[PDB]
Ligand binder design. Structure first.
Ligand SMILES: Nc1ncnc2c1ncn2[C@@H]1O[C@H](COP(=O)(O)OP(=O)(O)NP(=O)(O)O)[C@@H](O)[C@H]1O
Ligand SMILES: [Mg+2]
Length: 336
């Protein structure tokens, strides 16, 4: 049995795929730091940190060490990664493992060295890096080996990466800093400006999942829920109701940037490849791809068919996993 692992180091979620086990770990990429006499110390990581925040006062502080598709905190990213790697270690398995890590396509040398070191520091022999859109496309089923063109749109928490693949290569790649976190920030700004109500991340993610949509009902308001927060002048808790119409209104800006990033990618793409993507469709992946109507909105504005992958939260990790299982393929990237 193997200790070989592939890591999908998301801004919102970290996934680890183990050779011969599939997905062994799926946890929020948060660290909880307690502040004490000027210092900050790592208290919990992952689902534990997210649990004990939400039971949160004064000390317990939240660091997302990857954020907006960049490494913000090198010290805490290292310890996050270490924790996760140690946590999936199997003692009845091969020595120090081979590791694959999925990095943003707009990742610099430095951030790559940083990833690679955090992994060696955690007990790996060798480390290979694979560009995210390439992993997303493989994970999703795309025929990235054919000379036919393929398009993948990966909507994360901090980033939306759009890429066109052909012939085992990336022909075009671009990332924009818009995804599920800007969606939440927009819903929370909307609650403040229109209904004068302060809300949190959790209430926000809940609205986005429950009535969020990239396109308003043709009706007028559609469905509604009630959400709790607190009045921003009075301090008292309050309930307000909100429609799918309001949510659509709230999300239109970040949705529109996503749509614009797809149009821009098409305008850069070679016509013959563009016509291939026209036949098979644009493939959406990543958790942001689960927003209602988002595929329907990209279809209207581009003219192209659009499909959401199966298990879009897991694509990058499955694609990384596929490379891990294929020794000759993993070869290709350790030579990176
Ligand atoms: N039903 C849903 N509708 C809309 N958004 C959702 C839904 N479920 C999850 N999400 C969002 O999906 C995002 C996380 O997706 P994910 O693909 O895990 O991100 P990531 O890989 O960690 N970020 P990144 O490094 O930018 O690629 C969060 O912003 C969630 O709010
Ligand atoms: Mg991602």
């Amino acid at each position: 049995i193997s200790n070989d692992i592939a890591i999908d180091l998301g801004t919102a979620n970290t996934l680890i795929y183990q050779k011969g086990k599939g997905i062994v770990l799926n946890e929020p990429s948060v660290v909880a730091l307690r502040n004490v006499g000027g210092r900050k110390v790592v208290h919990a990581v992952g689902i534990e940190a997210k649990q004990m925040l939400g039971r949160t006062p004064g000390h317990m502080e939240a660091i997302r060490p990857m954020r907006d598709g960049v490494i913000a905190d090198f010290e805490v990213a290292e310890e996050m990664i270490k924790y996760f790697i140690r946590k999936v270690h199997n003692r009845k398995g091969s020595g120090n493992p081979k590791v694959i890590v999925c990095v943003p396509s707009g990742a610099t040398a430095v951030e790559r060295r940083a990833i690679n070191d955090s992994c060696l520091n955690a007990g790996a022999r060798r480390v290979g890096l694979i560009d995210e859109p390439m992993a997303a496309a493989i994970g999703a089923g795309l025929p990235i080996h054919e000379p036919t063109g393929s398009m993948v749109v990966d909507i994360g928490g901090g980033t939306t990466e759009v890429a066109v693949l052909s012939l085992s290569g990336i022909v075009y790649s671009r990332s924009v800093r818009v995804g599920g976190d800007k969606m939440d920030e927009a819903i929370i700004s909307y609650m403040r400006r229109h209904h004068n109500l302060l809300i949190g991340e959790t209430t926000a993610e809940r609205i986005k999942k429950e009535i969020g949509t990239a396109r308003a009902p043709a009706d007028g308001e559609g469905l509604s829920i009630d959400v709790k927060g607190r009045d921003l002048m009075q301090g008292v808790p309050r309930e307000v109701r909100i429609s799918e119409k309001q949510a659509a209104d709230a999300l239109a800006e970040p949705v529109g940037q996503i749509v614009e990033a797809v149009k821009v990618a098409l305008e850069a793409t070679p016509p013959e490849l563009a016509d291939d993507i026209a036949d098979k469709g644009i493939m959406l992946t990543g958790g942001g791809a689960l927003l209602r109507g988002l595929d329907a909105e990209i279809r209207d504005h581009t003219g192209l068919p659009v499909t959401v992958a199966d298990d879009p939260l897991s694509c990058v990790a499955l694609g990384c996993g596929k490379v891990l299982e294929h020794p000759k393929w993993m070869k290709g990237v350790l030579e990176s």
